[PDB]
Design a protein around this ligand. Structure first.
Ligand SMILES: Nc1nc2c(ncn2[C@@H]2O[C@H](COP(=O)(O)OP(=O)(O)NP(=O)(O)O)[C@@H](O)[C@H]2O)c(=O)[nH]1
Ligand code: NA
Length: 167
């Protein structure tokens, strides 16, 4: 079959995991999203001239520690770790998501991208420099996004695929 990349989107409640997923897949911004038991979506894209299938797995609605969250992390080949640039707590939580991924994968070297979403909103509390320093510590890219204005959305997911392809 065509090459498929299972990309898992993680982050604190309300950061925009689902809006990012739906913007990528459907090309629409949602004002609200109700997670279900399984929220995954597939779409063909071309990245660096190579066609592939993205299967996006959204962890929205999963509890912080649960069998289904672990199953999603076991299945994922790459991870978007999302915070919101107007919510400091969601940025402080990033280390937690990275630790959970490293635990489930039993590895320090897992394809990941740090995503700072909601860059369109006025009340920024996290600087790009802060996010870049965290990303540098983890050895991963940082991408700023807005699911609303569409800034950076493709870049975040496509960068994650590039990270998977480098391993
Ligand atoms: N202005 C703005 N609002 C956004 C952005 N991304 C998401 N939102 C809004 O933020 C709220 C939460 O988004 P949602 O995608 O449900 O976040 P989530 O991380 O999946 N939440 P949960 O894990 O609680 O289900 C929604 O009202 C959505 O419209 C963005 O980039 N900009
Ligand atoms: Na899109």
């Amino acid at each position: 079959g065509g090459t498929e990349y299972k990309l898992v989107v993680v982050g604190a409640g309300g950061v925009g995991k689902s809006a990012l997923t739906i913007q990528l897949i459907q090309n629409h911004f949602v004002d609200e999203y109700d997670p279900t038991i399984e929220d995954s979506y597939r779409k063909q894209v071309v990245i660096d001239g190579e066609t592939c299938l993205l299967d996006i797995l959204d962890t929205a609605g999963q509890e912080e520690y649960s069998a289904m969250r672990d199953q999603y992390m076991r299945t994922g080949e790459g991870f978007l770790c999302v915070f919101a640039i107007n919510n400091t707590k969601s940025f402080e939580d990033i280390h937690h998501y990275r630790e959970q991924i490293k635990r489930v994968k039993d590895s320090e070297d897992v394809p990941m991208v740090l995503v700072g979403n909601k860059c369109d909103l006025p009340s920024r509390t996290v600087d790009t420099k802060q996010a870049q320093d965290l990303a540098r510590s983890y050895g991963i890219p940082f991408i700023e996004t807005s699911a609303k204005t569409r800034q950076g959305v493709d870049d975040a997911f496509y960068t994650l695929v590039r990270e998977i392809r480098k391993h």
